[PDB]
């Protein structure tokens, strides 16, 4: 199935408290591999699953010194964000980046991203053809123009198309085990009565890997998304996932429900 | 493998 | 409109101490120093981002030292010349990563 | 070395086609560009290339090749102006290293 690489930033302005907040982060799919933080006593990336630990001093000190470069270039972008949108030194502000790739099953390259946000609001993003801005508001167009006159979108293609397809290979090859694992779903249900007339059931998926899962409710084949209750899907700690779903409805009949849960792992649409 | 070059806003 | 470099050509004698001056290109947030002798490509010096030096050439010497205090122009300082440090002084800036050259400092160090 | 180019002087009749080549060290590097260099002056960027393929523009083909890391500039119909020193010039990281340089000279 598909596959992905991404990075992750966060830059945060200390007003008056010093250097600002640099957080970098880096996935191949659900699955956490890089981190640098500028709050830790290292000042090195970090390596966060075991199939990284590998690489040798080049990969780290090359890792390093490019996250660090990152972080000077973003406390430069805060600034500079601050000037277009004449903010003054009293607020906190965050710049947020992502970048990455998309491979699909032949680990051919399948989409690039690259995408900024302001103050929780999207800044300027590459479009998917990967040679093209969409610029938010008047001053991302000052970026806009600055990356058109010296053709940051062609850089910036051959890093996602090439460079980028070619080390989330390497990592999925690395990451055999981890990585290209299916962990299917350990179901269950419970059952609850909050009252005589009105008794609650839940649906339980537990433990899988990819994160990605769909539980649905059917009343002989209906979509019951009235007095419905999805949990945003979480992480249980040890690379697994976790969610339920549960809808309550008259006490006695409860058959007449039945739960559907589809994720990549179950062969077949487990039903329950 | 972050992206050796940067780019200023 | 360029990059400007002063002086354009420079005698010392060996043990002296000399400076070289960098005007950029006022819209170019990084500039660079590289080093240049007859029969070779400029070797790269130091560079700077803003006002702040971000790298430094690992063979250079702290004879060499360079500073942009204000984030425009840039000096770059040698101490106790020696006859190996005459050579082509190459000041360039960028917006990005294209680079745009001064006229040079051409440095002639004798005894 | 970061980055190699061919050696030697390059003398090549007014009117033919003049061909310079370059290899690099690091693959994930992401801008290439060829300058010219006259004897007494500083460098002067010609073009850049950032794509796999070929760029064309007027006298000058330049080639990229990232599988095998190698930059060409090719100059059709040489000109005396275009007896120059030819440098090579790859990105590590934010910052231009250049290689040697080959210098080209045009024969009457």
């Known amino acids: 199935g598909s596959h992905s690489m991404r990075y992750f930033f966060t830059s945060v302005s200390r007003p008056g408290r010093g250097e600002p907040r640099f957080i970098a982060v880096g996935y191949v799919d659900d699955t956490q591999f890089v981190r640098f933080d500028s709050d830790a006593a290292s000042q090195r990336m970090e390596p966060r699953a075991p199939w990284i630990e590998q690489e040798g001093p080049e990969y780290w000190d090359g890792e390093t010194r490019k996250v660090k470069a990152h972080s000077q270039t973003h406390r430069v972008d805060l600034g500079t964000l601050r000037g277009y949108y004449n903010q003054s030194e009293a607020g906190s502000h965050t710049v947020q980046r992502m970048y990455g790739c998309d491979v699909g099953s032949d680990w051919r390259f399948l989409r690039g991203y690259h995408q900024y946000a302001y103050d929780g609001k999207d800044y300027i993003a590459l479009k998917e053809d990967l040679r093209s801005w969409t610029a938010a508001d008047m001053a991302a167009q000052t970026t806009k123009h600055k990356w058109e006159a010296a053709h940051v979108a062609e850089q910036l293609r051959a890093y996602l198309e090439g460079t980028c397809v070619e080390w989330l290979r390497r990592y999925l090859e690395n990451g055999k085990e981890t990585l290209q694992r299916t962990d299917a779903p350990k179901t269950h249900m419970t059952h609850h009565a909050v009252s005589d007339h009105e008794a609650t059931l839940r649906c339980w998926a537990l433990s899988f890997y990819p994160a990605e899962i769909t539980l649905t409710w059917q009343r002989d084949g209906e979509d019951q998304t009235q007095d419905t209750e999805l949990v945003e899907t979480r992480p249980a700690g040890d690379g697994t996932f976790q969610k339920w779903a549960a809808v309550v409805v008259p006490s006695g009949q409860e058959q007449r429900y039945t739960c559907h849960v589809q994720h990549e792992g179950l062969p077949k649409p487990l039903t329950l | 493998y972050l992206q050796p070059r940067t780019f200023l806003l | 409109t360029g990059v400007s470099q002063n002086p354009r050509h420079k005698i010392t004698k060996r043990g002296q101490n000399v400076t070289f001056r960098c005007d950029p290109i006022?819209?170019?947030?990084?500039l660079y120093w590289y080093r240049q002798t007859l029969g070779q490509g400029p070797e790269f010096l130091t560079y700077?981002?803003?006002?702040?030096?971000?790298?430094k050439s690992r063979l250079l010497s702290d004879r060499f030292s360079a500073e942009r205090p204000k984030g425009s122009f840039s000096t770059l300082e040698i101490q106790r010349t020696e006859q190996g440090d005459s050579a082509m002084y190459l000041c360039?800036?960028?917006?990005?990563?294209?680079?745009?050259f001064g006229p040079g400092t051409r440095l002639t160090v004798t005894e | 070395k970061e980055v190699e180019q061919n050696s030697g002087p390059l003398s090549v009749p007014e009117g033919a086609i003049a061909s310079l080549n370059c290899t690099y060290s690091?693959?994930?590097?992401?801008?290439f560009f060829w300058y010219r260099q006259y004897s007494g002056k500083s460098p002067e960027l010609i073009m850049f290339?950032?794509?796999?393929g070929d760029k064309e523009d007027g006298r000058f083909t330049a080639q990229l090749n990232k599988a095998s890391q190698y930059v060409s500039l090719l100059i059709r119909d040489s000109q005396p102006s275009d007896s120059a020193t030819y440098l090579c010039?790859?990105?590590?990281?934010?910052?231009?290293?250049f290689g040697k340089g080959t210098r080209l000279h045009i024969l009457p």
């Open positions: 690091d693959r994930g590097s992401q801008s």
């Open positions: 010039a790859v990105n590590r990281d934010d910052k231009i290293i």
């Open positions: 700077f981002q803003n006002e702040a030096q971000l790298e």
């Open positions: 360039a800036s960028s917006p990005d990563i294209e680079q745009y």
């Open positions: 006022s819209e170019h947030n990084r």
């Open positions: 290339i950032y794509s796999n």
